[PDB]
Design a protein around this ligand. Structure first.
Ligand SMILES: OC[C@@H]1[C@@H](O)[C@H](O)[C@H](O)c2nccn21
Length: 482
């Protein structure tokens, strides 16, 4: 419809933002993941992942949609990179599909898979887009899950390190910025606490599991796998390739509902279980105190050697930040362990004095709370010794069921980005060592359990034709970044 092409004046209101408002060399980019954008899930030599198996169960994804094709970046990568360049972005964080490189997780390399990533990276470099390569975004090769239950076995650690090592050796001559994992908290909690994500394990889940122990086991092995991969990079590659390696951690801002000691403690406890679970080991070589005291024997311990390997195993930390909630003390605690989520012993709140903390996006979990990004970045600065940070994801979603015509006029997303980036700038002006910002995501894509019912892109994708239509938010970035 002709209204698709109405010029939204919001595009040109940058709210005082520009590159001059950020540090010299500050990177702006977009982020996506292999499974969510590539397609060719069962082609090109790619081995099955745990999500290929998980999606097979009817009812798992709305309308039984799959990511077998999704937005087909496998074939359309030049177009996508061209849009990124045209909108003024400096960088693209993509992920490498483990099972596209090693169909069964180990051993035989799938050369067709290697050739794909080589094409993608060479084109990015040609067009002057900086590659940031994440090694893992939820896509464990099914064979490793079948062999020894994947993240639940110590066997996975060296399996991951070998895969990482291969990637460094193969792609590290042009990829200078690496991440080991996207959101290991999500991998552990959604995969093994409530089974919402693959492999769908939890207490009483059809696939089996134990919510009291398995999340902590998976998280422990993810931390070890991260540190073993970083060891490979540091000992064999870093000096020659002159790149950097880190990890991507989700961080919801938890704000005390009131200034009571109990509510402040509740908020800290939520931070500990959400972020500290991974960041305390990396920065201090130990788990958070609250977690140790609450979870006790159900949390694995690091050997002295492991602790040394894990501590300072990053050159920077990616903070994936979207939203904030209020946190309350929930009263006396139940003494019987039931789940990781229950181990937090906190109460969530979404409003205070009849006022919502913010408007909701399409996603049930996503509340629009711009001030939260400032508090979250300041918290990491003050708590973890002013580490080098990348704000590695930020964005919001519309319903999937919107047309091209209305889908492109995403004024709410412009406001989201203007406000959140403004609040991030305040944190940086106050001393936070943030070196980059990445929007989730360039394209509308396969949104895990929500399938195609959620649209996170700054570029609309018609799923019938796979044609791209930049939304007003993409043009907002284009104007702001120029
Ligand atoms: O929900 C939108 C996106 C996901 O598509 C993706 O897994 C990303 O890593 C992420 N972290 C928090 C939210 N999101």
């Amino acid at each position: 419809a002709p209204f698709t092409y109405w010029l939204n004046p919001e595009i040109y209101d940058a709210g005082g933002l520009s590159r001059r408002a950020f540090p010299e060399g500050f990177v702006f980019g977009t982020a996506a993941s292999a499974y969510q954008v590539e397609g060719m899930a069962k082609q090109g030599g790619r081995g099955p992942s745990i999500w290929d198996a998980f999606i097979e169960k009817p009812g798992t994804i709305p309308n039984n949609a799959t990511a077998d094709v999704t937005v087909d970046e496998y074939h359309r990568y030049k177009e996508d990179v061209n849009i990124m360049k045209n909108m003024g972005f400096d960088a693209y964080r993509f992920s490498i599909s483990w099972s596209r490189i090693f169909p069964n997780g180990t051993g035989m390399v799938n050369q067709e898979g290697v050739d794909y990533y080589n094409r993608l990276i060479d084109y990015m470099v040609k067009k002057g887009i900086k590659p940031y390569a994440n090694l893992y975004h939820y896509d464990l090769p099914l064979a490793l899950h079948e062999q020894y239950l994947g993240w639940l076995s110590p066997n996975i650690v060296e399996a991951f390190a070998d895969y990482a090592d291969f990637c460094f050796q193969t792609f590290g001559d042009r990829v200078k910025d690496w991440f080991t994992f996207n959101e290991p908290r999500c991998v552990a909690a959604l995969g093994y606490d409530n089974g919402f994500h693959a492999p769908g394990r939890c207490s009483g889940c059809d696939a089996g599991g134990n919510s009291t122990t398995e999340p902590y086991l998976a998280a422990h092995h993810l931390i070890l796998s991260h540190a073993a991969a970083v060891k490979r990079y540091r000992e064999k590659y870093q000096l020659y390739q002159k790149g950097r390696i880190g990890i991507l951690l989700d961080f919801v801002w938890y704000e005390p509902f009131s200034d009571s000691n109990a509510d402040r403690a509740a908020a800290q406890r939520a931070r500990d279980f959400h972020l500290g679970w991974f960041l305390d080991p990396i920065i201090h070589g130990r788990y958070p105190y609250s977690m140790l005291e609450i979870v006790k024997d159900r949390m694995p311990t690091f050997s002295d050697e492991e602790s040394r390997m894990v501590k300072d195993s990053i050159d920077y930390v990616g903070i994936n930040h979207y939203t904030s909630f209020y946190m309350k003390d929930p009263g006396p605690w139940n003494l019987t362990p039931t789940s990781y989520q229950d181990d937090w012993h906190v109460g969530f709140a979404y409003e205070r004095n009849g006022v919502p903390i913010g408007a909701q996006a399409n996603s049930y979990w996503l509340y629009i709370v711009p001030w939260g990004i400032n508090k979250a970045v300041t918290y990491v600065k003050e708590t973890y010794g002013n580490p080098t940070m990348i704000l590695s994801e930020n964005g919001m979603d519309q319903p999937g069921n919107v047309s091209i015509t209305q889908g492109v006029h995403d004024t709410v997303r412009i406001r989201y980005y203007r406000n959140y980036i403004t609040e991030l700038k305040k944190a940086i002006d106050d001393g936070a060592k943030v070196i980059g910002y990445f929007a989730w995501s360039l394209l509308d894509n396969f949104e895990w359990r929500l399938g195609y019912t959620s649209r996170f892109g700054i570029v609309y994708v018609d799923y019938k034709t796979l044609k791209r239509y930049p939304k007003d938010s993409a043009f907002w970035f284009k104007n702001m970044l120029s």
